[PDB]
Amino acid sequence: IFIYQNNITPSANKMIPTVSPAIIETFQESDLVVNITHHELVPKHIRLSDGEKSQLLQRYKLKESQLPRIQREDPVARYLGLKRGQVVKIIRRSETSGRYASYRICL
Amino acid sequence: LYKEILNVIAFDGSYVNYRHMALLVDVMTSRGYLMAITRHGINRADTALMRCSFEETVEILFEAGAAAELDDCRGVSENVMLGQLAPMGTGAFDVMIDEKLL
Amino acid sequence: YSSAPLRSVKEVQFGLLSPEEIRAISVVKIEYPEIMDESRQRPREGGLNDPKLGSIDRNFKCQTCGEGMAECPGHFGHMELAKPVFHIGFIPKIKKVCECICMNCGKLLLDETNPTMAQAIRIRDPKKRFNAVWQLCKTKMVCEARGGCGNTQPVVRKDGMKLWGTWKDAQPERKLLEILNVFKHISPEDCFRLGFNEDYARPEWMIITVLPVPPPQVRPSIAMDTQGQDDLTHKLSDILKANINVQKLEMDGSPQHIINEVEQLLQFHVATYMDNDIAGQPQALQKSGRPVKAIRARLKGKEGRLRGNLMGKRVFSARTVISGDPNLELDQVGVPISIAKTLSYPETVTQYNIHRLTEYVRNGPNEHPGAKYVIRDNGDRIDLRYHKRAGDIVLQYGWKVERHLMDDDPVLFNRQPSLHKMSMMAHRVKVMPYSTFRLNLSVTSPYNADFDGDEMNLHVPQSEETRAELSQLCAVPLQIVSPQSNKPVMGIVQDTLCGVRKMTLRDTFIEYEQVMNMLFWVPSWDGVVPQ
Amino acid sequence: ALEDIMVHYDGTTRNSLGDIIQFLYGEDGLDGTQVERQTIDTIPGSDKAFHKRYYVDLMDEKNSIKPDVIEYAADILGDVELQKELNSEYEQLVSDRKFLRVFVNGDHNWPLPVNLRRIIQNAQQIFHLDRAKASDLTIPEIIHGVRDLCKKLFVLRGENELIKEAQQNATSLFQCLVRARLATRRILEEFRLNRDAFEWVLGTIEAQFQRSLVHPGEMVGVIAAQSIGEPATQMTLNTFHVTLGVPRLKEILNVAKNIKTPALTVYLDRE
Amino acid sequence: STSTVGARRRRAVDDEENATLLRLGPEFALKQYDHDGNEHDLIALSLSESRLLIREALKARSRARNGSNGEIDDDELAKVTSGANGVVKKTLDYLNTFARFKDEETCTAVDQLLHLHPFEIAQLSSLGCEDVDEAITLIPSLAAKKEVLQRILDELNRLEDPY
Amino acid sequence: QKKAMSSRAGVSQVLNRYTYSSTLSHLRRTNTPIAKPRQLHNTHW
Amino acid sequence: MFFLKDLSLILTLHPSYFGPQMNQYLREKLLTDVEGTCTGQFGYIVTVLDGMNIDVGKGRIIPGSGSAEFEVKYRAVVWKPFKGEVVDAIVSNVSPIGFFADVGPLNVFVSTRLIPDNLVYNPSNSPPAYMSNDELITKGSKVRLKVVGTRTDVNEIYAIGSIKEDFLGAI
Amino acid sequence: LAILKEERTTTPYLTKYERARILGTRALQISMNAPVLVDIEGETDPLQIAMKELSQRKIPLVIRRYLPDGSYEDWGCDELIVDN
Amino acid sequence: GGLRFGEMERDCMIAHGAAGFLKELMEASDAFRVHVCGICGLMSVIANLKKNQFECRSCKNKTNIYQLHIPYAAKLLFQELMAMNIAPRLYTERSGVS
Numbered sequence A: 001i002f003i004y005q006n007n008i009t010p011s012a013n014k015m016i017p018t019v020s021p022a023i024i025e026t027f028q029e030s031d032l033v034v035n036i037t038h039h040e041l042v043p044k045h046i047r048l049s050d051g052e053k054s055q056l057l058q059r060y061k062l063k064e065s066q067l068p069r070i071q072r073e074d075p076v077a078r079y080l081g082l083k084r085g086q087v088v089k090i091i092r093r094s095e096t097s098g099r100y101a102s103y104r105i106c107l
Numbered sequence B: 001l002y003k004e005i006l007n008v009i010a011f012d013g014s015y016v017n018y019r020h021m022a023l024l025v026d027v028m029t030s031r032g033y034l035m036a037i038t039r040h041g042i043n044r045a046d047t048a049l050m051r052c053s054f055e056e057t058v059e060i061l062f063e064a065g066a067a068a069e070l071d072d073c074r075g076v077s078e079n080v081m082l083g084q085l086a087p088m089g090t091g092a093f094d095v096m097i098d099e100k101l102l
Numbered sequence C: 001y002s003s004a005p006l007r008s009v010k011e012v013q014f015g016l017l018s019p020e021e022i023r024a025i026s027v028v029k030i031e032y033p034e035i036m037d038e039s040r041q042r043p044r045e046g047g048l049n050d051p052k053l054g055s056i057d058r059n060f061k062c063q064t065c066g067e068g069m070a071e072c073p074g075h076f077g078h079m080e081l082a083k084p085v086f087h088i089g090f091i092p093k094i095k096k097v098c099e100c101i102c103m104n105c106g107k108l109l110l111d112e113t114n115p116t117m118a119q120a121i122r123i124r125d126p127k128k129r130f131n132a133v134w135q136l137c138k139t140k141m142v143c144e145a146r147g148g149c150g151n152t153q154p155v156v157r158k159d160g161m162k163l164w165g166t167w168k169d170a171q172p173e174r175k176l177l178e179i180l181n182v183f184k185h186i187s188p189e190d191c192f193r194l195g196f197n198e199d200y201a202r203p204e205w206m207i208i209t210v211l212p213v214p215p216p217q218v219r220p221s222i223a224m225d226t227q228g229q230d231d232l233t234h235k236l237s238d239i240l241k242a243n244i245n246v247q248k249l250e251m252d253g254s255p256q257h258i259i260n261e262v263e264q265l266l267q268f269h270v271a272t273y274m275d276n277d278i279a280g281q282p283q284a285l286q287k288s289g290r291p292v293k294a295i296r297a298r299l300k301g302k303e304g305r306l307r308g309n310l311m312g313k314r315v316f317s318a319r320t321v322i323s324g325d326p327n328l329e330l331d332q333v334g335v336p337i338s339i340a341k342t343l344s345y346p347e348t349v350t351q352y353n354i355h356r357l358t359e360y361v362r363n364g365p366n367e368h369p370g371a372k373y374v375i376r377d378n379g380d381r382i383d384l385r386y387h388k389r390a391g392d393i394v395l396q397y398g399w400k401v402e403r404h405l406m407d408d409d410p411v412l413f414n415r416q417p418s419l420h421k422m423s424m425m426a427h428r429v430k431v432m433p434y435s436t437f438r439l440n441l442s443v444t445s446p447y448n449a450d451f452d453g454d455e456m457n458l459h460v461p462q463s464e465e466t467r468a469e470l471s472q473l474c475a476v477p478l479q480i481v482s483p484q485s486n487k488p489v490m491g492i493v494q495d496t497l498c499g500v501r502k503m504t505l506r507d508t509f510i511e512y513e514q515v516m517n518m519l520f521w522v523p524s525w526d527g528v529v530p531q
Numbered sequence D: 001a002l003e004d005i006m007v008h009y010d011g012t013t014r015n016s017l018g019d020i021i022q023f024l025y026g027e028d029g030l031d032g033t034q035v036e037r038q039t040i041d042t043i044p045g046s047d048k049a050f051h052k053r054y055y056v057d058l059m060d061e062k063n064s065i066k067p068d069v070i071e072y073a074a075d076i077l078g079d080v081e082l083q084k085e086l087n088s089e090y091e092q093l094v095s096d097r098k099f100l101r102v103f104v105n106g107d108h109n110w111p112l113p114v115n116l117r118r119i120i121q122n123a124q125q126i127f128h129l130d131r132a133k134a135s136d137l138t139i140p141e142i143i144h145g146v147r148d149l150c151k152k153l154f155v156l157r158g159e160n161e162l163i164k165e166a167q168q169n170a171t172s173l174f175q176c177l178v179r180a181r182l183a184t185r186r187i188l189e190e191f192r193l194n195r196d197a198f199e200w201v202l203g204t205i206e207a208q209f210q211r212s213l214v215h216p217g218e219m220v221g222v223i224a225a226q227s228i229g230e231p232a233t234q235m236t237l238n239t240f241h242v243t244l245g246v247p248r249l250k251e252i253l254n255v256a257k258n259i260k261t262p263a264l265t266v267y268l269d270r271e
Numbered sequence E: 001s002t003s004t005v006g007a008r009r010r011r012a013v014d015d016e017e018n019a020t021l022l023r024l025g026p027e028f029a030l031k032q033y034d035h036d037g038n039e040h041d042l043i044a045l046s047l048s049e050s051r052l053l054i055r056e057a058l059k060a061r062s063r064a065r066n067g068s069n070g071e072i073d074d075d076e077l078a079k080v081t082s083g084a085n086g087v088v089k090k091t092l093d094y095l096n097t098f099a100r101f102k103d104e105e106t107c108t109a110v111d112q113l114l115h116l117h118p119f120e121i122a123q124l125s126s127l128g129c130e131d132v133d134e135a136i137t138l139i140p141s142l143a144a145k146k147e148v149l150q151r152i153l154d155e156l157n158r159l160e161d162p163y
Numbered sequence F: 001q002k003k004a005m006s007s008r009a010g011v012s013q014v015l016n017r018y019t020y021s022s023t024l025s026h027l028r029r030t031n032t033p034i035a036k037p038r039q040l041h042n043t044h045w
Numbered sequence G: 001m002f003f004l005k006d007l008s009l010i011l012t013l014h015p016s017y018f019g020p021q022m023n024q025y026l027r028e029k030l031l032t033d034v035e036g037t038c039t040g041q042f043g044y045i046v047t048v049l050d051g052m053n054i055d056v057g058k059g060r061i062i063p064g065s066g067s068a069e070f071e072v073k074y075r076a077v078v079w080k081p082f083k084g085e086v087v088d089a090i091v092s093n094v095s096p097i098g099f100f101a102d103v104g105p106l107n108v109f110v111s112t113r114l115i116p117d118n119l120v121y122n123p124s125n126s127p128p129a130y131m132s133n134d135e136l137i138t139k140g141s142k143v144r145l146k147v148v149g150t151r152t153d154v155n156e157i158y159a160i161g162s163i164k165e166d167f168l169g170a171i
Numbered sequence H: 001l002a003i004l005k006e007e008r009t010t011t012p013y014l015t016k017y018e019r020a021r022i023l024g025t026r027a028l029q030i031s032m033n034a035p036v037l038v039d040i041e042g043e044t045d046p047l048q049i050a051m052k053e054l055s056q057r058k059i060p061l062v063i064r065r066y067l068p069d070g071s072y073e074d075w076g077c078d079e080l081i082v083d084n
Numbered sequence I: 001g002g003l004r005f006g007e008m009e010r011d012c013m014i015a016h017g018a019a020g021f022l023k024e025l026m027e028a029s030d031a032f033r034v035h036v037c038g039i040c041g042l043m044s045v046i047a048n049l050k051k052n053q054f055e056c057r058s059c060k061n062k063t064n065i066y067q068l069h070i071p072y073a074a075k076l077l078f079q080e081l082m083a084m085n086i087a088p089r090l091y092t093e094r095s096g097v098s
């Protein structure tokens, strides 16, 4: 997790996915001054073991694609450091039931 | 997105129930980002006969016979176009005579 | 009745006609460009329309597959073009394909070898694959030698109905004729690499060799008792003629560079026929200025087949002028006798209603509580107003009778613009006099009508369930509480409202004489005058 | 854009692809028709006036149910085991009060299935209750009884947990409204319900609710689609009297990259 | 109509010739599919063995339906439990004037033995045979699937129920 | 006429005859080939 | 050659027959539509095994009218000749162009051109026969033939064949 | 496919659409000279006859409810509680 | 003529979940019996409705044939698409599953 101040070189970062299994992320400084999750509109998200996931799917009879998605370059997706294939349970307040439980897989 | 749409209905005195706006809001949102309710949106998802019944009608078919698309016929539209009962409430199931109980 | 098993479409497969198939299917060699006249004699020359295709004039004739006009869907014929042509709407892809494949050879321009290509090659999406691919191969123009012959690939551009490119000091311009051949060679795993399908639609078929000629029901003729021929039944002939001359220049003193000048014409008329609304203007008007509807014009949304004839069609229906009636239960709808005596309802004969039906039938189509058609098991119909056995007929359980709509028949009443679940509601029928649909006031705002001339459409259910479905979910009473704003959507309007106010004030008093005639008007009245 | 959206036999709102658009229609699985503007008591008012309403203290001369309300008012004063079920309860209501302040506005009026205000008013005269002679409910009768109710207000039905969770989830809000009107204090001091009445109100809340649930089949999309566009045909193209109304909705549905009025509201920091 | 338990999706011309090259229709592959959704070996039915399956069903049939010497004792069980279906009479006479056995055991035996790809195990049973040169000829699919089979061929005429 | 429909239809119509004030009106009519033009300008006084 | 294939059939049923013993009527109608049919696809449907436990499954009610649709899943005994297949039946008829034989529910015909030359068609003989240097064939006589080709027809599958090879002919 | 009479999850109540259509079907069924399982206590209009056939839960019919994935749940008209 | 049941009228019925009635686009308008091919899902079939003869040479069939009920406007939609060279195959059984 490198925290580049103004910007990294195009020659540089072109060396990230070059050391698997391990994985690396890049975060600009001026973009972490305020924790975005902290926002009013931002509801709480949550990761899911390939167990809690392989469950949601059986429990709802879903074909993975039929599940609401979330972007890899999504502000929150990055924050919790998701990956293509991981699921996320969102839990927010609802003026209809009190709390609703939605899920987004990360494409 | 919701808040903004709501404030557009509500700025007119008219009242609509959450569930409605929400559903719309949700449909635009779910595929990952902000899919617009336009020829360049929903009418561009993995939904051929269907999307063909709105805006790009013909080319939508052309590049459909081109890549040889297969249509479920799971869309309300397909069935209307076919003249079959569509999987809509009343048709979202089957009705069979139980000989045993008969 | 058709012995063949009855089924419903559970899947639709799209693709492009392989020339060999069109040939297969065709029942007409279609060589001549005229219609019929065996030298003025009316018939149908073995040349154009019906050289075995469908038919006109109420003549079973149609390759003995009889059926005459109604029952006989059309029958396709074909036409061997003199030289390969571009399918007007695919000209875009046909071009983007070449931009991605090499000529003189015919294979991809980026193999698993190129990394950025692997990726594109893994993108599972018949469309975004062929998308990402082209975004790559449109740059490299050297058939690098794996496969061989690095002949430089030209940069292609669109000029009207022809694809041309330059090979490079200073270029060298040539007009790509040739293409089809290259495509045919394109590898099978390659069709698939691009957005294709080896079975249903191979890249090559985007170019037409043998043209599929659609039959009469498609381009019907309209005689004036005198000629009368459809629009398409012309640009078929315009094409046919542009084909004839071509060939008769390739088997005679063929001035090889004065033929192409005549090939471009056929390419055009065939562009026309299917599409006649393009970039390179030349509207291609029919003698008179008339634009000439291209097949694709018949489809363009709204008015055009898809949105005009399928997502909505004219349909046992009636419409006239509304005026409200303050003495009709909320859910009723007064229908002018005239109309009830016109709209019928197929009620099968049953030992519960035989007695009443045999009466309604004798009554004839001109007495109101009557009927107008009796249909025996033998799929045939008796017209209750002519048949010499009009008043005769004694029914048979199982026969169906078409009776006049009667009081308490559920029917769909509506007023468009139909933007509500409530713009259409099922009402109890009440046959009444005078030429107008008489609806209740409180059921006014749902349709949003007034009586300054406003008209209303009425539809009549036809099955025993159709009706039920209309009364169990669309009945006006079920509609009183609107889901859109979780509150009712019909209240007390005008007079009734205005007055209900007055009548309420402490100052409003009524004496016995009237307090009685008032209690009488309440139908449910317990029959007890309150202290 | 919503044609093919319809509640499914499992209570999922999906389309012609099975793609789940909503796991429980409206985030509760309720049919708008059966819903009315109720007022969640708990939320509004002072901490002082709150307590004086739902608080019951059997271990106290001044904060106990006077034996003129209950039929065991004196034989109940001081019971430690009862004052505990009475805590579970009062401790709950407080969890609510703080959980509802979901609505940072404080506005306690919201659309909620099963109209409890009336449902009780029906008991009111069905058994003719006097604002004088005492009820006949064990404190367990009331408290325990409202818990057994919550158990039958089923929306989703699944056997497993993820489902059973959704159950509790998409319900909650209701339950709070439920407790709010079925706190021992109110149920006895406000609407003197007999033992009989209570068993009726309860039974009805339950029944009513079950009817108020959405029906799988409900062609939901076309519904909300219109429900939204309809109250739009009734607006003016004008943006007079920030870009709003007709053109705005337009602006939005288009997911415009350059709205006429962009503007942006920022609030100071806490202090 | 009446379709089998092999529902393939014929998506938009590949049915080679039928020969004793053991290339039976696609509807009779060595691997057909059971009604319960299981995999099951084809069902070879040499004559006589066929004559039994038939006689047995026509019987437990004329049972719940009431809930040259055999040429007759079979013509009767017919005009009662049969559509009343000439094809069967023929398939029964023929299957009874050529059946090579009589006892459900003598038939069990042949099978407990012979059991090659189903068609063979049957042809060998319903067709008289002496030499291998002969069997390998009237059953041209064998040839290299069993050295000159001769033993077995004998063991048949040895259990070849008398007539 | 010809392959020139690229003209304007409207010029010359079928004179009204429902009422007298109908006919007068019809003759004193103006057209304008196609939110601001439709307005009643001042100059219109 | 005889097989036991696991088929199924669909029958629509008018509401009239919605009595207490319905299972019964479907079953008996099943038989009227299967036992005796013939498709080149499935061959000769001749007999339905294990009647008693026939499978009906619940049937669905067609929307327009009232009938119920049942997918009856059974199992039966069938027989469909293959090319190159070898069997033997009783000679049925016999002309100048050859003779027809009957193997079960079938009739395979042998051409005077698909026999051994030294066997000529007999002129005035009763019943008309064929003479060999030693053999004599007529109606009655049993023949073992080889099915060269097969033609699928109406509700009957006929074929052709020869006895020009070895080990074929009378027995 | 399938789904035991057990582990059945859908509503034990009858959707307005189910009832509407059941009565629908059974109604025309009767008008098709079908056989009735009640006492036409003088009734003659099929939908009425069927409405009765409902209140006495003697309408031999089964609703095969489909799930988005493709599986189903069978329920008899007798079972299905008919609140509405 | 007859009053049109245009799109908007469609919509509503669909909102009502009035499945059958809406299906009844068919009974009150188009409807039509076309004969498809079990193989090349087309409206080719030469159905001489009497002597039963069905066929569809080119695909040379006389055995696997189906009859269907669709709105003639639609039958036309297809004939049209074909003459534009696109092939709307009509299949009576799902093979792709899901």
Ligand SMILES: [Zn+2]
Binding pocket: C054, C062, C063, C065, C066, C072, C073, C074, C075, I046
């Ligand atoms: Zn024809």
Ligand SMILES: [Zn+2]
Binding pocket: C102, C103, C104, C105, C106, C107, C143, C148, C149, C150, C151
């Ligand atoms: Zn090359």
Ligand SMILES: [Zn+2]
Binding pocket: I037, I038, I039, I040, I041, I042, I044, I056, I058, I059, I060, I061
């Ligand atoms: Zn075909």
